[model samples]
Target: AQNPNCNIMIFHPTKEEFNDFDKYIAYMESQGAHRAGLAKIIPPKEWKARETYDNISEILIATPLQQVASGRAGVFTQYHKKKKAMTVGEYRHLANSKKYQTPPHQNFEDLERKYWKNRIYNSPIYGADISGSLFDENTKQWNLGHLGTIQDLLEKECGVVIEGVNTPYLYFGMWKTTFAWHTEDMDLYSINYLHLGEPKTWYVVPPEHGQRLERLARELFPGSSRGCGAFLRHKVALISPTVLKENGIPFNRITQEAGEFMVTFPYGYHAGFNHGFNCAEAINFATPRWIDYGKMASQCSCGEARVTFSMDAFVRILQPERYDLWKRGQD
Candidate 1:
């Protein structure tokens, strides 16, 4: 089945619907919902609205496989910095020989050593933290062992049991300093609630227009060491929950008033930047415990499949108890 573009319906609860906090909480509890911090939804004015669903659907649906191929074109952005200095083939050769060293003129090795040393000794937290040491080509995994037990303690404390046998977990976090995009694997239907301070811009692009967004990202940060590859196939959607005009743009000026919503994407691209506010709390779900590149690729293009990733390893890492609870529900 193909996913068609549809207007997202917004629901504003009346005083009776949420007459009391306790009643609202109980309702969400009955629906297996978890509480999360509010997300500020800015107006459409802040963004130029470069493209829309009707414009790019044809091109995307035409060559779905090519798009998927391009989606996996690179391993991960972690290697972008080093790869910027060299091509992938060259880097692979250098890595295979194990003879590559910092060029004498640049002395990047010493510079990196100093940078890491400062990060460890200056913090006085994890003594002599060498976590950023160079990667090993043979093992194909980072040298550092897995950190202690990773658990979704937040869901546990909330006491909300999830349904389905193989639930997934996904998380997104934004930094006040850099507005770095952070996301983890999770279920697609999981509800997200965000609490924000200051003001920020959020954009929702359709998967078909991923290439255009990629171009925009490149233009925004040309010559950036990090390539806009990961963002290639995702669509953008805007959430403007409030109304305020600022800097010739309309923004949702969020304060102590928190906003909540449930986001379910079969495959979509979502990103944002903090205008100076702290973005806190993004909670969601995951399932099936296996990677589905086809599903992701479709979601990127048609936005058809609202299914989330299902990687058991990731579920175990983030929400083991939720997995158990979901399993119980199935039984």
Candidate 2:
């Protein structure tokens, strides 16, 4: 999944700019940072999230290991089926174990019968509701749901906690645990912050090229495309930047380190895998700009369940004055 050919825009916003999360991201987007579909933000040096294995030491989680070796097409052929409930601490130990220290190469073994490689992907924190604390004290300012920035405009409009949509979800990664190429929920924006540990490599395609990426996916996974309108959401396929470039599709790569944030734009397709042991948190958000994209998402596909919530209802809540004006005119 490594692509040495392309790179993403990395922003190092000063303390003042970084403090205003929404403004900074908006500025970055206006500057065409969204053209790459992903941007990595490194906060001011003073800000930090206190890292510890203790926070999730006893939390039980299901581990899903990708059976195929690295660099191969992700066909969803053979995945670990049996539920292996392991504590975060136990899984972390396995990830950091000496036997799995080295990174996987193209020639890496397809599977290990003796010791399986498992990953804790997209596991939500115990309490990520609006009233509950999603992260440690210092990290709260950057928490996607509670940031108080325009990024949380959707949450503010809804006036309710939406788990995984507005609330943060935790992820634990080991080398080569892949997340398939896809857009955000409802075609909204998303932000992923690596709390602590190793870097995660990402591959992204700009919004304009999103259709091209889908075309390629449809060609590669015909059965998946035929079965589901949003086949990418299944996390069943992985395409290398090499393949993307070979087909004249634009893409960029970035390595997201601990303390860094990766922001994805609406309808901008992205996918990536972990470098080694690490933990990350991510949540979806919406600015006024996302409304049209959300509308487009709903109308475009029949197989995908696009209406998680009503876009019209959300818009009315987001802007009552405009909604009222439109209502009056409708008569």
Candidate 3:
């Protein structure tokens, strides 16, 4: 039935509603507005917000994600670097490719200080996440989305047995560090709140056309659209709008500012890069509509899909009857 299209929706709450964080979350939930969304959640000034970040800014720049010395740091940042410096045209090629070598490691402080220094992309960075809330001042409240999870809700409301899933992964990105084309775990809805930093430009396609985007991708690369595993990233295999433009697939771009929430639809093929260093918090959620996407992703052979609801992970922790039987058999 055309699904009563609002296509994409934007909601701006009154200052009163905005201040009541949980109330706004409840309102969105009640509306059943299951599509991409932008919410102007303009937060008030935090105590010492400027000073706290300003201090961290210098420290972070001084220290790349890797430890400066001694043993390796638990967390590391990955910025793919290659020795092969290619020119716009055909300028230089090593007579012997083996003659050139890229270092297996780079120094923390000595790494090039170009835009690459700003490249903190993917995964989580807990330095700022420590306070919990997006603000500094040592008072951080969990993002409303993080307050709960669909997995737990399913157990509580639907009588479905499930295992624990990890919290929403935090991310820090600087200029040019990019999130390539990808879907969330099992096609879940994602909320990314730009805590602070410069705006991020996002390119998003609607969920309805997700399959079409994948079909177009299949034409470019060999393999089903489940992706060629992690190997896809090596080949620069993102569904960037550049290619989609040729296929006449429609997508939209929105520049998200500080204190705004960007809600991505399930299975929406989206990618974009930071205009500058940005501190954003992202969490996952699922409504009644998400299961279809989950099943479709599962049927499509998505590896990460099972990893989240992993039987192995559950068995390891629960030591259920299956584990008992296996342990005894090993004896």
Candidate 4:
């Protein structure tokens, strides 16, 4: 599911700081960023005429390498390479083949072992070695280079971190039609700025509330119906702009810009649907930190089961420590 408890604030930075927008765009382009599809942008009027200060003047910026590399190229190289190109009927036949049976659930440790084994056996395809090697190498170098340049520019050129955050960098991407909703197990907050081209339904509900809602949806919609199972339990709050205000939810429609507005907290519950026939993009930001699972673990249903491992074990396996140095800054 997608996150719901957090509040979202939208803006059109282009209207607020035209010069900065041009400069940032140029800089990102120079660094090999890709053009993200259908992002929220200020109307031509606002871009050329806005004068007064607006606290929520923000716009979505897409990171070229991350989004492009992960979406199109990665998926094809990793998953679709082995399958021969075929017509719809042939593809459907393969999908329904008896060899496509689902695997049984195993404990986390067992799952990890099986994953590694599969990785080694399918090294040419499913393995990270094939799909991720070059991308990982290039992106890591790109990140370091940009980090240095950004630091120098912020210190000497801009004289502040206003153009970007100090850590936990921001990235933007397009939400594909088949994007799935799943809870992130990290202690960070994210905001997904919504935009145009497609209309999608947003759902927010507590994790514990999911089971009850799922059962109710199953009863109401029944088997094979549109609104059946946990999928339908996603309490859709927004349909489109016309239905936005009518829902009585506190959402700020970004006339100047539009995209999926998203904010994430550790264990937050949220989900969304891509409005049919169009594509959407969103900007996401979060500060990376070492999560105190001891605190979060207490809230888990299997708290005692998790406490068997030490914090270091948890950190090394489930979550990794973020930055080596520690300092304070505004949230």
**All candidates' TM-scores?**
0.30, 0.73, 0.59, 0.29
C-alpha lDDT values of all predictions:
0.27, 0.62, 0.47, 0.27
Candidate 3's residue-wise lDDT over 214-310, tens digit each? 6665665554333543222222344444457768866666678776777776777676655544677777676666666655542222332233343
Question: What TM-score number comes out for model 1?
Answer: 0.30
Write the number of the candidate with greater lDDT, choosing between 1 and 3.
3
153-201 per-residue lDDT for model 1 (tens digits): 2234334343333322211111111112222234232233323322233
Tell how far residue 173 is off in model 2, in angstroms. 0.9
Best by TM-score: 2
Candidate 1: lDDT over CA atoms?
A: 0.27
Q: Model 3: residues >4 Å from true position, as ranges?
A: 1-7, 15-146, 223-236, 299-331
Query: Candidate 4: what lDDT?
Result: 0.27
Residue runs of model 2 more than 4 Å from their true location after superposition: 1-7, 51-55, 62-82, 104-134, 138-140, 148-165, 298-331
Please give the distance, in angstroms, between residue 156's alpha carbon in candidate 2 and its true position after superposition.
Answer: 7.3
lDDT of 3 at 120: 36
Q: Tens digit of lDDT per residue, candidate 4, span 1-331?
A: 1223322322244433434433534433233221111122223233322122132113212112111111221111111233233332332233234432112435433432332233212212110001001111233211211233322332444343323322222222122222223333232223342333334434343333434333443443344124222232122211222222343423222121242233433333444333222212222222222134212421222121121112223323332232111001000
Q: Which stretches of model 1 miss by more than 4 angstroms? A: 1-9, 13-191, 211-257, 262-264, 276-279, 286-294, 297-331
When 1 and 3 are scored with TM-score, the better candidate is 3
